[PDB]
Amino acid sequence: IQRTPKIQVYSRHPAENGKSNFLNCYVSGFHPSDIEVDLLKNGERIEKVEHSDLSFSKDWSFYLLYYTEFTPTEKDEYACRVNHVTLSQPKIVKWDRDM
Amino acid sequence: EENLLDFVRF
Amino acid sequence: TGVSQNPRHKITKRGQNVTFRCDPISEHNRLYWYRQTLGQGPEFLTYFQNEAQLEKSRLLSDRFSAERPKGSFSTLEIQRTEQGDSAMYLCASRYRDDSYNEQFFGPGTRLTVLEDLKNVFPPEVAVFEPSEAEISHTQKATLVCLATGFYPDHVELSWWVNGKEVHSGVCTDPQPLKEQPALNDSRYALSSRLRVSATFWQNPRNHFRCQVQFYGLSENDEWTQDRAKPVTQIVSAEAWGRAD
Amino acid sequence: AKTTQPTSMDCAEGRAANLPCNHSTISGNEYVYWYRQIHSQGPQYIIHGLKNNETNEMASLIITEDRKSSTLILPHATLRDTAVYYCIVWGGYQKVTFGTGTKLQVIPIQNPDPAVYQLRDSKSSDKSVCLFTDFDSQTNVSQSKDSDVYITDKCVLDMRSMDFKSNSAVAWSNKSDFACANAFNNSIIPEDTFFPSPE
Amino acid sequence: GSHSMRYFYTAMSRPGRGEPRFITVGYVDDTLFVRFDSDATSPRKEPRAPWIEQEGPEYWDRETQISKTNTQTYRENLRTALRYYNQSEAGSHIIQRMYGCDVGPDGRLLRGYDQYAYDGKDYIALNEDLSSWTAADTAAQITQRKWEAARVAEQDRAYLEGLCVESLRRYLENGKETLQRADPPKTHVTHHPISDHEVTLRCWALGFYPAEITLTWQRDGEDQTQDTELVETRPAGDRTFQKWAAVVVPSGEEQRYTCHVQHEGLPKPLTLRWEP
Incomplete structure (x- = not known):
């Protein structure tokens, strides 16, 4: 009872464009643990994204890392879309290699 | 290693 | 006395099945199974918490299978009984806090697996009057009882003065001795003493019975041989007071 | 392993009694536990703790406090206390491993009167059954030795409405050779014992 | 200069969609090295750091049987909670524990941690003197007086001053070239x-x-x-x-x-x- 999550979307190594590369969505500072994260591509799903093991911080707040696998071309947009019990409508955060 | 008591309970 | 088990004893041929039971005190979280051969401490078998089998040692052959479905009672089943399974099967439990590791044991089911049942003998009980020398010297009277020869050694002895049980002045052999000890199926023999005042024995209306409960074969079991059947029975010998 | 005890062990009713155990590794999150099994039943708990000191209704328990070699006291020993005692280390959660362990015998004071009577009846068996009895607890009864003739180990009856206690041992056979004059001749008997022939 | 070791527990009642789930994760510094999840399909402590893989199988049995035990223990603890707080059965709740130790640079103890939490709220805490507890609410006070009388204090302290720092020093050396660099x-x-x-x-x-x-x-x-x-x-x-x-x-x-x-x-x- 009962925190809403915080979201950052980013690449493992800085992009440009078709290198190699990794895409991350780190959610943190939330509770309870029942979370639903999907990394998106031009609107759609991208399917079967691996996610890390579940853990939490000093304040009992949970944090996960959802990672996968792409080519950061400047003609294809990206991703993170997170839903939690506190959020009444999915929060969708766009990716930017400048941030 | 871990430590299990065990009889430590709520 | 919390923990109860079913049955107190069992006897079977070789390649046979048999299942025990343990009903622990409700609101006991954990339940343990042990086996105990006479001479050693209890060896660990399995251990349950609630309804789940957490630990089990390499002593558990595949033939053994413990189970505790509702997380209350537990059934311990042996598939193809061997002569090496012969032992006391104890079952203890723990309260659900507790704090400390306080295991509460039950009476224990007593298994004895045999090559064939022809070895199963009852006891024959007889009692021996006290000595006149002892009376006139010590002003006492030591009655003695020898119950022999019986197999297996699962028997319990008790005295009854004037048709009423007595524990005062009684010393029974703790464990019995073998008659032909160099044999694997040797029959056993147990001694006991009841001691009373010379003037109580010298009263010829006082009665003395040495009783021996024998735990043996089932009514169920398949007996073949010419002599009587060795069913779980009670053999006894009487003796009365002498005026002398 | 972990758990060296004297396989057995005597004591006198009733001081002592003084019941050692060597656990010479044990790391410091492991408790020292003592259980007792009174012959016919089937263990109870006695005492732990922790690495400490400590002291309840049954039982004191003194740890080295260097953790090393604990000692059960059983403070005024009595006949009821004669049993097999187990010294086991528990680290939490794990299984208990009862050892062998220590068999404590507690034997009384007296007023003695060694004698070997010949009993009777039977009148079926039959017949003769010698009863070596009323001896002091510094006497030890011995073995058959020839296994035509049986001899039970000593045991103590409590009268108990008088004082009153007495060590007794029974021996018997089924022959003519056998008589009560020669029943305990490979047992070292007190050299002043009573020997009657009521024949 | 120093280092740390921390195990984390997550118990999560979930009624209708299971029996409760119980997860355990183990860190050294910011390196995850051991994982347990009662979902399983056949559960046991799993190795997530390369330097832990090199251990006895008897190490892993200890560690599994610990978390397998704790599976039940907490399923109980989740229900003992419901009574204390008078909570509805249909509700889904969470227990969270963290315990561990800090060394550090010479190789002793510095301080101890043992902290429980209910539905993301401080429940009970082991103080830094490693012999007394902090009760957050009147419900935790039950569970304090339980441990007070059960002398749970010392069996941590014995572990936290013993096997915690002992094992940590072992882990560090064994995987020094990733952990101490x-x-x-x-x-x-x-x-x-x-x-x-x-x-x-x-x-x-x-x-x-x-x-x-x-x-x-x-x-x-x-x-x-x-x-x-x-x-x-x-x-x-x-x-x-x-x-x-x-x-x-x-x-x-x-x-x-x-x-x-x-x-x-x-x-x-x-x-x-x-x-x-």
């Missing part, structure tokens, strides 16, 4: 653009370990203190970490602003600027 962050400062009569610089920290770091950064300065813009220290994914400060400054200023970049991997700590 701090990595410096590869730092640069990017220009963004903006306004145009106003810009945003951005001080980048990348590819470093552990997560502990400070980026905040100047002009003359102090500075900033306040603009800022700091961002949550996020995990790269390769057991390295990331972070930036901004900041927003007027255009053509501009080499006034200097960055500032404390890490234990470095000697210096560094000072960077827009290049270009």
Whole structure:
């Protein structure tokens, strides 16, 4: 009872464009643990994204890392879309290699 | 290693 | 006395099945199974918490299978009984806090697996009057009882003065001795003493019975041989007071 | 392993009694536990703790406090206390491993009167059954030795409405050779014992 | 200079969709090394660090049977909670525990941790004197008086001063070359653009370990203190970490602003600027 999550979307190594590369969505500072994260591509799903093991911080707040696998071309947009019990409508955060 | 008591309970 | 088990004893041929039971005190979280051969401490078998089998040692052959479905009672089943399974099967439990590791044991089911049942003998009980020398010297009277020869050694002895049980002045052999000890199926023999005042024995209306409960074969079991059947029975010998 | 005890062990009713155990590794999150099994039943708990000191209704328990070699006291020993005692280390959660362990015998004071009577009846068996009895607890009864003739180990009856206690041992056979004059001749008997022939 | 070890528990009642789930994760510093999940399909402690893989099988049995035990223990604890708080059966709840120890640089104890929490709230806590407890609410006080009388205090202290630091020192040596070898962050400062009569610089920290770091950064300065813009220290994914400060400054200023970049991997700590 009962925190809403915080979201950052980013690449493992800085992009440009078709290198190699990794895409991350780190959610943190939330509770309870029942979370639903999907990394998106031009609107759609991208399917079967691996996610890390579940853990939490000093304040009992949970944090996960959802990672996968792409080519950061400047003609294809990206991703993170997170839903939690506190959020009444999915929060969708766009990716930017400048941030 | 871990430590299990065990009889430590709520 | 919390923990109860079913049955107190069992006897079977070789390649046979048999299942025990343990009903622990409700609101006991954990339940343990042990086996105990006479001479050693209890060896660990399995251990349950609630309804789940957490630990089990390499002593558990595949033939053994413990189970505790509702997380209350537990059934311990042996598939193809061997002569090496012969032992006391104890079952203890723990309260659900507790704090400390306080295991509460039950009476224990007593298994004895045999090559064939022809070895199963009852006891024959007889009692021996006290000595006149002892009376006139010590002003006492030591009655003695020898119950022999019986197999297996699962028997319990008790005295009854004037048709009423007595524990005062009684010393029974703790464990019995073998008659032909160099044999694997040797029959056993147990001694006991009841001691009373010379003037109580010298009263010829006082009665003395040495009783021996024998735990043996089932009514169920398949007996073949010419002599009587060795069913779980009670053999006894009487003796009365002498005026002398 | 972990758990060296004297396989057995005597004591006198009733001081002592003084019941050692060597656990010479044990790391410091492991408790020292003592259980007792009174012959016919089937263990109870006695005492732990922790690495400490400590002291309840049954039982004191003194740890080295260097953790090393604990000692059960059983403070005024009595006949009821004669049993097999187990010294086991528990680290939490794990299984208990009862050892062998220590068999404590507690034997009384007296007023003695060694004698070997010949009993009777039977009148079926039959017949003769010698009863070596009323001896002091510094006497030890011995073995058959020839296994035509049986001899039970000593045991103590409590009268108990008088004082009153007495060590007794029974021996018997089924022959003519056998008589009560020669029943305990490979047992070292007190050299002043009573020997009657009521024949 | 020092190190840490922390196990974390997560018990999660979930009624209709299961029996409760119980998860255990184990860290050393910011390195996850051991995992347990009662879902399983056949459960047991699993190795997530390479230096832990090299252990006895008897180590793993101990560790599984601990968490398998704790599976039940907490399923109970979740229900003992419902009674204390008078809570509905249909509700889904969570218990969270963290215990562990800090060493550090010589190789002793520094302080102990043992902390429980219910539905993301402080429930009970083992104090830093390792012999008394902190009860958060009147429900925890039950569960304090339970442990008080059960002398649970000492069996932690014995473990936390013993097997905790003992095993940790072992883990460290065994995987020293990944755990006792701090990595410096590869730092640069990017220009963004903006306004145009106003810009945003951005001080980048990348590819470093552990997560502990400070980026905040100047002009003359102090500075900033306040603009800022700091961002949550996020995990790269390769057991390295990331972070930036901004900041927003007027255009053509501009080499006034200097960055500032404390890490234990470095000697210096560094000072960077827009290049270009």
